[PDB]
Structures are given as C-alpha cells and as structure tokens.
From a paper:
[name] is a class A serine β‐lactamase found in [name] (Wang et al., 2006). The enzymes in this class utilize an active site serine (Ser70) to perform a nucleophilic attack on β‐lactam rings, forming a covalent acyl‐enzyme intermediate that is subsequently hydrolyzed (Fisher & Mobashery, 2009; Strynadka et al., 1992). [name] can efficiently hydrolyze penicillin antibiotics but has low activity against later‐generation oxyimino‐cephalosporins, such as ceftazidime, due to their bulky C7β aminothiazole‐oxyimino side chain (Sun et al., 2023; Wang et al., 2006). We analyzed the structural changes in mutants of the β‐lactamase [name] from [name] obtained via directed evolution for increased ceftazidime hydrolysis activity.
Author numbering: 28 to 83, 86 to 145, 145A, 145B, 145C, 145D, 146 to 238, 240 to 252, ...
Write the structure that this text describes.
C-alpha cells in the first residue's frame, strides 16, 4: 500500500492541503507528504521561541518580571490579559505562550530576544543556527494569521519545523535542564487534545504545540513516545486556501492524519 494515497484521500475528503513530516529514526523510515511545501506557522513558532529564550539566558532569567499594559494585549492572550496589573515573569510567559498559545506572552518573549521587527529577526536567526534555512518569522502577532496564502512571511515547512523540534526536544540543542522545561510545557499543553493527541492511542505520550488561523489553517507539532518509550517527532500542517480567508480549520483532519501516522509507527 502507499500512505501517500491515504493522505491524498484526506485532502479530498476535507477539501484541504495537508503537510506531514516524521523524521526517520534508528528503527523507522521518514514519513513525508508535501513536507517541503510552505505552510503558515500560526502559533507553532511559540515552541522554538521559548527554546530561543532558554538558549540565550541563564535559567535565573525565568524569574525576571515583565510589566506591560492593557494596550499591549494583542491577539488571543488567555493568561496575559489577566495579569496586566501584576506583570508576568519570563518563565510564566514561556508557560503561557506554549500551554495557552498566548499571543501577548509570545510578543513579550520576542521583545526579550531583542532587535529589529520586535524580536522576529532574532528568532529567525535562532532557527538559522539550528540549520533551518527555510523558516521565517516576520511580524509580531496582532491576530491569528489570516494573511493570503501567497505571502511567504511567517512560514515554515513540515520538514523544517520537524527537524527543529527534533533537535530541541530529543537532540542536544539545549542542555538537559533547559530541555526539560520546554518538554514539560509542551507535555502539559491545553490546546491540542483534538489534534495529534486524538490520533494516537492513550498509552502513547504526546507533547505538542498548536497553531490555527485563517484560510482554514490548522497545525500541530508534536513529540510522541510509544508505550515502550520510543520517541518520534510528528509535524502536521494544513490549510484550505480555496475556501476563502474564513475557511473553517479542521482539527479532525490533523487527528486523522495522526491516526494514519500512528498506524505506521505502532
């Protein structure tokens, strides 16, 4: 059989474009479907963003209090908009940016990295340092990404983001103490239950970071561990460019793609 045929059937059933990459391992072949096509990051960048902040600072930095105002609340910010009067530490911002996909938290972390484009250049440079020549972040988050499909800004590929996540969570891009923080925040994400997690059996561990936007955009990037403790990186991206800027994102597409992947890996 050919797994690519089954992904193609998902595209036709959901009226969508689907991108998948699972890196090869010591025991398995790579899974790749539109893996070198660009898809919007949406909030999936927030996981490597936290890595960038961890990489460039001692862990004492997580205690630094960041203050901000109600006028700094941009895009969907479930945590930050409750803490305007207190502020939030860098560690709390990392937590919110991953686990609640918090936009303001991410924008404050980008500012913490520094420089032109409100930290977006610095973030892209971090990805370049991990061997990613493809991905780019170009703007702070002011809304969920509903920019036209033709705009390359704020895009990655399943292949590129998967290999970034591989190095961050499973490789040696971060020292163990920093790696643990990233892993735990993704492990306790609150936004991903209906995506990759929904396609893997309950005895597999799943850690993830979602993204969702206009033009039917729905993404999930994950690391999964089998019931015997073998890890795999799974990146699934999707959009519906022909359905208009307000095309509905389909979490179920990601869940079914992940089920297809689990069938290969189990």
């Amino acid at each position: 059989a050919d797994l690519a045929d089954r992904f193609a059937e998902l595209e036709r059933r959901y009226d969508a474009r689907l991108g998948v990459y699972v890196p090869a391992t010591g025991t398995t072949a790579a899974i790749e479907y539109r893996a070198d096509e660009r898809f919007a990051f949406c909030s999936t960048f927030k996981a490597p963003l936290v890595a960038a902040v961890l990489h460039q600072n001692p862990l004492t930095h997580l205690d630094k209090l960041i203050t901000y105002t109600s006028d700094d609340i941009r895009s969907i910010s479930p945590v930050a908009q409750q803490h305007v009067q207190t502020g939030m530490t860098i560690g709390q911002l990392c937590d919110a940016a991953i686990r609640y996909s918090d936009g303001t938290a991410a924008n404050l972390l980008l500012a913490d990295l520094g420089g032109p484009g409100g930290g977006t250049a610095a973030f892209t440079g971090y990805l370049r340092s991990l061997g990613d020549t493809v991905s780019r972040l170009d703007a702070e988050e002011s809304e969920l990404n509903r920019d036209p499909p033709g705009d390359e800004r704020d895009t990655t590929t399943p292949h590129a983001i998967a290999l970034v996540l591989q190095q961050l969570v499973l490789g040696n891009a971060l020292p163990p103490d920093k790696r643990a923080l990233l892993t735990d925040w993704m492990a306790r994400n609150t936004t991903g239950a209906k995506r990759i997690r929904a396609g893997f059996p309950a005895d597999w561990k799943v850690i993830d970071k979602t993204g969702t936007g206009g033009y039917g955009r729905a993404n999930d990037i994950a690391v999964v561990w089998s019931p015997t403790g073998v890890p795999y990186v799974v990146a699934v991206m999707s959009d519906r460019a022909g359905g208009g800027y307000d095309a509905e994102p389909r979490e179920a597409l990601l869940a079914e793609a992940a089920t297809c992947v689990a069938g290969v890996l189990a």
